[PDB]
C-alpha cells in the first residue's frame, strides 16, 4: 500500500470537540480560541515545534435536551488586538471591524474559516493569540430558553518543523510543561525478571 495515511495533512484531520459552552437563563459568553484545551490535540501538537495552518470552526447549537426553538443568535469573532465585549449591550457588538454571523437554531450550523493570524511565519508552543469568540442572543429582552453549544475545529494545510520527543508525563498547568517532582512514572511497563519473555 501507499504512505498516504501517515501524511501530515491527514494526521490533523477529523475535527473533534474543542469547547463546550453553557448559557443558562448573563446572556453572553467569551471563549478564547486555544488548541490545548483537552488532553487530546496537545500531545499531538507538541510532537513538533513550528506549525503553520488555518482554522475551520462549526457551531452546533441546541437546547440542553435535544429539541430546537426558533431563536436567532450571533457569533462575533474578535480580531487579535481588539477590545472584548464586557456587557450584553456594549458598543463592541456593533463594531464593523469585528466580523459576525447571524444563524438560527433551526439552521444547519455555521462554517467559519479563520486564517493564519500570526505576525511570525509559524506558531510557537515553546518560548500567538489567534483570537477570541463572543456568542450572544439578539434583541433587547431576555430570551426564555437555555442555550448550549459545542465548537468543533478542523486544521487544514498543516506544515510542521523541528520534531520533538513526545510527552509521557501528565500535565499540571496549561502555560508551561511542568511535572510533579514527588514521583517520576516509568514510560514502559515493568516485569519480574529480564529473562522472562
Amino acid at each position: 500500500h501507499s504512505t498516504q495515511e501517515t501524511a501530515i495533512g491527514n494526521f490533523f484531520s477529523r475535527a473533534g470537540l474543542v469547547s463546550i459552552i453553557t448559557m443558562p437563563t448573563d446572556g453572553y459568553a467569551n471563549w478564547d480560541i486555544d488548541l490545548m484545551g483537552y488532553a487530546q490535540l496537545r500531545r499531538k501538537c507538541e510532537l513538533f515545534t513550528y506549525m503553520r495552518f488555518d482554522a475551520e470552526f462549526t457551531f452546533v447549537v441546541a437546547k440542553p435536551n435535544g429539541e430546537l426553538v426558533p431563536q436567532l443568535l450571533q457569533y462575533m469573532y474578535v480580531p487579535p488586538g481588539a477590545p472584548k465585549p464586557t456587557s450584553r449591550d456594549s458598543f463592541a457588538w456593533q463594531t464593523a471591524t469585528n466580523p459576525s454571523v447571524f444563524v438560527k437554531m433551526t439552521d444547519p450550523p455555521a462554517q467559519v474559516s479563520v486564517p493564519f493570524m500570526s505576525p511570525a511565519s509559524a506558531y510557537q508552543w515553546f518560548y500567538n493569540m489567534m483570537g477570541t469568540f463572543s456568542i450572544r442572543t439578539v434583541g433587547t429582552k431576555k430570551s426564555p430558553h437555555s442555550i448550549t453549544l459545542r465548537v468543533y475545529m478542523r486544521i487544514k494545510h498543516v506544515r510542521a518543523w523541528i520534531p520533538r520527543p513526545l510527552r509521557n508525563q501528565p500535565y499540571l498547568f496549561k502555560t508551561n510543561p511542568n511535572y510533579k517532582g514527588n514521583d517520576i512514572k516509568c514510560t514502559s511497563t515493568s516485569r519480574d525478571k529480564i529473562t522472562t519473555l
Binding site: 511570525a120 510557537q124 510543561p177 517520576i184
Partner: protein, 156 residues
C-alpha cells in the same frame, strides 16, 4: 564524522568534571558567549580526554526551544530521565545528536544552522547526558574533563 542539522575564532568554555554520580549539564545558546571576548550559525565541538581503562558513554544533542519546568558554566540537571521538561531521554535521538563512547572515539561536533520563525531576532540548547555512568578501579583518575569549543559562522 561531521553531522549537519537537518541536512542544510574558536571560543573555549570551562571544563566540566565527569564524576561517578554526575547527572548532566546543559548550556543555553547564544547566552554562553555574551560576556567573553542578530543572525548567525554555530559550530560546536565537544571532546573529552580519558584513558583506555575508563568506560562510559555520553549523549550530546542540541535541542531547539528547550524550556524548563518547576519541580558560561552551565547548570546541572536534577532529573535526567525527564530532562526537567517532561520529554524522555530515550527519544532524544530525534534531534541532531552524537554519541561519545569512551571505547572508540573521543570527539563530537555538530553543525547547527540558523532556525527561527523570524529571520532577524535563546534559540537552542546543548544537553550532555551521561547515559552510561563512568566506571574505573581504585588508583585511577576520578574525574574526566569535558571541554566545549564553540565556533560561530556567518554572523549578521
Amino acid at each position: 564524522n561531521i553531522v549537519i542539522a537537518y541536512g542544510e575564532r574558536f571560543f573555549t568554555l570551562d571544563t566540566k568534571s565527569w564524576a561517578k554520580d554526575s547527572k548532566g549539564w546543559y548550556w543555553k545558546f547564544p547566552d554562553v558567549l555574551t560576556e567573553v571576548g542578530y543572525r548567525s550559525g554555530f559550530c560546536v565541538h565537544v571532546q573529552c580526554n580519558a584513558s583506555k581503562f575508563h568506560q562510559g558513554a555520553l549523549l550530546v544533542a542540541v535541542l531547539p526551544e528547550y524550556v524548563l519546568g518547576t519541580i558560561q558554566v552551565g547548570a546541572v540537571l536534577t532529573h535526567p530521565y525527564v530532562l526537567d521538561a517532561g520529554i524522555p531521554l530515550s527519544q532524544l535521538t530525534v534531534c541532531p545528536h552524537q554519541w561519545i563512547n569512551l571505547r572508540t572515539n573521543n570527539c563530537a561536533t555538530i553543525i547547527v544552522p540558523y532556525m527561527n520563525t523570524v529571520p532577524f531576532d535563546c534559540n537552542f540548547g546543548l544537553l550532555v547526558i551521561p547515559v552510561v555512568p563512568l566506571d574505573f578501579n581504585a588508583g585511577a583518575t576520578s574525574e574526566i574533563p569535558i571541554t566545549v569549543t564553540i565556533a560561530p559562522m556567518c554572523a549578521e
